[PDB]
Ligand binder design. Sequence first.
Ligand SMILES: *[C@@H]1O[C@H](CO)[C@@H](O[C@@H]2O[C@H](CO)[C@@H](O)[C@H](O)[C@H]2NC(C)=O)[C@H](O)[C@H]1NC(C)=O
Ligand SMILES: CC(C)CCC[C@@H](C)[C@H]1CC[C@H]2[C@@H]3CC=C4C[C@@H](O)CC[C@]4(C)[C@H]3CC[C@]12C
Ligand SMILES: *[C@@H]1O[C@H](CO)[C@@H](O)[C@H](O)[C@H]1NC(C)=O
Ligand SMILES: [K+]
Ligand SMILES: [Mg+2]
Ligand SMILES: [Tl+]
Ligand SMILES: [Tl+]
Lengths: 39, 992, 268
Amino acid sequence: EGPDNDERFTYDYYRLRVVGLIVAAVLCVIGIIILLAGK
Amino acid sequence: LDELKKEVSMDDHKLSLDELHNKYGTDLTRGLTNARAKEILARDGPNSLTPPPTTPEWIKFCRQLFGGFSILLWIGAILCFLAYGIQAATEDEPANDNLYLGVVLSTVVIVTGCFSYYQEAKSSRIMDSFKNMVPQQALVIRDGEKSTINAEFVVAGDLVEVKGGDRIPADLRIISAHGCKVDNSSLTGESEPQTRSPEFSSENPLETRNIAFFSTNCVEGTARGVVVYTGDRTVMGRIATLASGLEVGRTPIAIEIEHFIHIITGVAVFLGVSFFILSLILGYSWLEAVIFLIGIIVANVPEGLLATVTVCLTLTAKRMARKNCLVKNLEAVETLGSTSTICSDKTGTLTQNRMTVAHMWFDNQIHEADTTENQSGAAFDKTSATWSALSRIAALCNRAVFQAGQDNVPILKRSVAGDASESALLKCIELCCGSVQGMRDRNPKIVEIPFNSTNKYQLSIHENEKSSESRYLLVMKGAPERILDRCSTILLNGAEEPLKEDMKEAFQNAYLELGGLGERVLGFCHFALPEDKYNEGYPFDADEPNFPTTDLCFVGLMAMIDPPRAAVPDAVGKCRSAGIKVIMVTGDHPITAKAIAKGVGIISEGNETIEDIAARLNIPIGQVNPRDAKACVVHGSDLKDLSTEVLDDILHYHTEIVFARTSPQQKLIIVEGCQRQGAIVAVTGDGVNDSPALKKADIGVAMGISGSDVSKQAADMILLDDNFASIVTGVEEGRLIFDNLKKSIAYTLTSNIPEITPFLVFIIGNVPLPLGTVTILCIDLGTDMVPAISLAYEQAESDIMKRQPRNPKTDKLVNERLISMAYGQIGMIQALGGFFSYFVILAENGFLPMDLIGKRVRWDDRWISDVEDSFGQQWTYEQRKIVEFTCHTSFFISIVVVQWADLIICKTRRNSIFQQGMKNKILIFGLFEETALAAFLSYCPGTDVALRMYPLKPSWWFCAFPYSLIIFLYDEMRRFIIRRSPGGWVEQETYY
Amino acid sequence: FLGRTGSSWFKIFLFYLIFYGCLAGIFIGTIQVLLLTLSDFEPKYQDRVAPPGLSHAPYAIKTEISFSISNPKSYESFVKSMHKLMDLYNESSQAGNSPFEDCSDTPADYIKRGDLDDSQGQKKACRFSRMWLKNCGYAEGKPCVVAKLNRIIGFYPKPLKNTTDLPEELQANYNQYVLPLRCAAREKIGSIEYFGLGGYAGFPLQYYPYYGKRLQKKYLQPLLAIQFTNLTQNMELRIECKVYGENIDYSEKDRFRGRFEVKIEVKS
Ligand SMILES: *[C@@H]1O[C@H](CO)[C@@H](O[C@@H]2O[C@H](CO)[C@@H](O)[C@H](O)[C@H]2NC(C)=O)[C@H](O)[C@H]1NC(C)=O
Ligand SMILES: CC(C)CCC[C@@H](C)[C@H]1CC[C@H]2[C@@H]3CC=C4C[C@@H](O)CC[C@]4(C)[C@H]3CC[C@]12C
Ligand SMILES: *[C@@H]1O[C@H](CO)[C@@H](O)[C@H](O)[C@H]1NC(C)=O
Ligand SMILES: [K+]
Ligand SMILES: [Mg+2]
Ligand SMILES: [Tl+]
Ligand SMILES: [Tl+]
């Protein structure tokens, strides 16, 4: 917007962290699954 | 020091009984005086063995703390505390950087110390096992009276008494004996009881009957003797000292490790000081000049590599534990793969160590029995009525019996009370005719004449199990020729017939052939006594010939030997196909040694000794060109008068070598001879007479079930099931781990470049620091760890058992070709991918690549809270630093992303991934966990403080992707060239 | 030689020359495409400069400006940087209707010169006289520090509204058009005096938004002179100058995030 362009200097680092941690966890689980296919 | 002990012993068995007493101030009848014995005790010292001085574990741990990488990491750790000290004095720095990094680095050294300490293990209790062979007490005659004393109180000169069941307390001169037999397997590896008597019977004291040795035991009878040697001075006490004293030495794998440590340490100190001066010339304060150096150290040293090696070794040892192959020393996991020569004991190693029936001669025909443990062969005969007649004599004319409670274990494995030949016959009949006890119940023995030294035969009279007869049957066995002189008829295919010169000659032929096979041959015959001349109550006199022992019916011959283990012939061939030379080294007699050599394939068909040529051509042995003989058989008595140079010529000039009737020191000498030629040597054995050889071997392998305690103490590896096929597996595993270590090392080293280059450009370019010191440790200690380990699970790319053993002088674990690829090619591509992401982060935040050159001065200036970017904006100190640390984080993640491809390319040295596939589940695990770790390290809250890791935007992850792919393609194209032309260019330049 | 023969030494050179040549050419290519995705007038991200920093002229050794009044070369270090900044706000530097403009001598509202486009020439910036900075060689005794708000493209600094309570409660509250700056230390052993545009202790909103170096060269940002004529002497005084606004925030880590950290000591 014009004088109300506050969103330009903002970033949702909170969501990014939530998503990043979700991904890291799921990649960790996936890895266990493939490894445990025989121990 | 031990050169004296490598020599054959000198003795006094040639002296008379009386003469021997003068030498030791002793009485043949009364024995020593209580006072004289105590005097000699203080004089000579105790009848005991002293263990050699060991190196304490303290010094062993700390010796690892100073080996190249640890030295550089120490210089880094201290240089951290140096810069910290210089700070704490000058400008009060409330930070924790240099202090904590110095603590972290010192911990890395200590923990790495534990890994190398675990790898360099030496579990040796040789002298302890020998000490277990000296009895607690001995029986001596002192002041004309026999008393038990502490065996350590035994001295040279006293009168000792032994009987069946006790250990020889010391080396004795036999002066009196009654039916005494002894087990000399300690000195020969052969357990057949040897008679002991006062009479001298051989110039060689190790063969004479009037000497009994410490480390052996009396098996039966009784004997008295004069002690000639005590403690360390006994024949086997010296073997003990020799074995326990032998310098261990460095393994092939250990030598390889130190070698690449020098290389990597070299480049480290090179670039280290090469850029330390390069910085001072650029006008960098010593305050900074050291900080850069610390970074250089951390970049160049692969912090997690030595521990990787240890884990890869451990994991390989775990797989072998699962095939009944125990590894006592982690490094011995690889030596077997580098082995070019095997020196093998025969008895209990190549052989089962059990007299077993091998052939039978009946119906004018040679039949072969199955000698294998698990009976993997086939039948020979069952139909012939002759067989049942021979079978009956083998069962009936036999005094051997199975021990109680064996019905669970297989026939051939069960313990038997009796001599070896009777046990063999027992197990033979029990196997192919069912319960022998049944045959001995159906035919009650009424009278017998046990085998006599003079008679040379054993006879028995039984009540024929037949109801229509129920009469008296006579059976006998003995020396083949003696049995022949007592026969008139031969049971041919059922019916008897006169013994014509024809069949008599066929007998001699059969007899000569079986004997030529190194087999012990016995004759078997029977005689159905006439009914009218022998009533159902007729008494037979065993003392005086009350019955005919002539004109009997010859039934057949039986031959026997201590046979090879089932898997041995095939394992020997497999070793030989892998280009390993196999030598036999045995305490046994030459005829037996040679016969098993041919049986297992040590001596291949057609190959001759000089003696064979001479007999065939009917010419003198001196007339034979010795170069025409590729095979040789050396008796220990001849070995004794040969110099090592002459032993070296024997080793060089023959492909098929048999060393027979060797002493324990002689086995050591043969091993050393092989090593002297530059060969990596394995020893396989099971007896205490293998202990020195096993110790000196680059790798000693002991048999687990049949092995003596001493042998297993002297070994690096134990075959827990006595499965000789495990040697073949071991060499295969050894070769595989050697190749996989290269892959894992290249992989680990490759990521050094993207950690070095940022520090260099930091100096030469004056840009903001692309990657931090902490960030490097997150790679080498964190992400790269599981992937690097996973390479240990790689399958072979080709048939490794088809290639020759590596040349330890030329074929190195880390060579110039590895460095060229890891440092010069792949690592260089990784460095760029790192920098790219660095420029991406900065440029997208407002600092375009052009304006970055020569900005570090203002960038690092803590007091400039207004640096201008390319777009004209102003940044505080902490703001731009957050972007900088975000650059460290994405550079870090870029390494991980480019290591994805590197992990896949390091999978194979030659083959394509499209050929080898992706069947390594540990490797795939590594990829997932590596990426999980990196993501966690970036996104986990609080990690921005502890590790300076900042959250990355999704687009950031993909910066290095095009570089990751170029790596995959590049290496795939390169290896395509290797395969397409075995010529050499790409091969001799980059083929690891 | 060391490794190989001459023929081999050559081939290894011909390779790495072509190899590194290609790699350099590829690296440059990826830099090209990166630049191609970026604007010339505005950076892709601005969240890392977001809350504006407040920086001053006196180059602090360590957020500190200690000196002796009874000594000449004791303050000549701080006068060097003080001069460096003010030397830019010269009248001879601001000449003609291009590219400067005379703007309200009293704090006014924002000025939009269109978009971040080159569809116009150099966007005309408001003039600023260093003569608006009353009282301030500089203050040889009791320094005359000069404040500054960090430039951010397209940033509209918004003052706080007088809805509730305020630190400098309602005094000279030019609510609509002034971004205030109140310095503080309890510990009240000083004498705060502020100088600026229109005589206000703030930044005139008529100098915003900044259009960037590419679209506005020679642009001048508003200054706020602060004088501490403290009646005290020979002691470290921790003085913090704070700016207030809707778009202004602070951090415990970044001690320059919309605020000062000055340790004055007139040890004379
Ligand atoms: C900006 O203004 C300052 C004001 O002090 C100028 O400093 C002048 O320097 C000259 C020569 O050194 C002196 O004779 C004067 O006394 C100073 N003041 C004035 C008001 O003229 C400085 O030269 C100016 N800088 C530029 C680039 O124009
Ligand atoms: C950051 C940049 C400027 C550094 C570049 C370093 C280059 C020149 C280095 C890195 C790895 C190096 C190579 C590594 C391996 C070998 C194989 C060896 O048998 C001869 C030297 C040779 C061929 C080296 C020559 C120089 C080399 C290519
Ligand atoms: C600032 O200077 C003016 C003259 O320009 C003078 O009248 C005044 O006293 C000075 N102020 C202070 C607080 O010293
Ligand atoms: K050994
Ligand atoms: Mg043996
Ligand atoms: Tl490293
Ligand atoms: Tl590394």
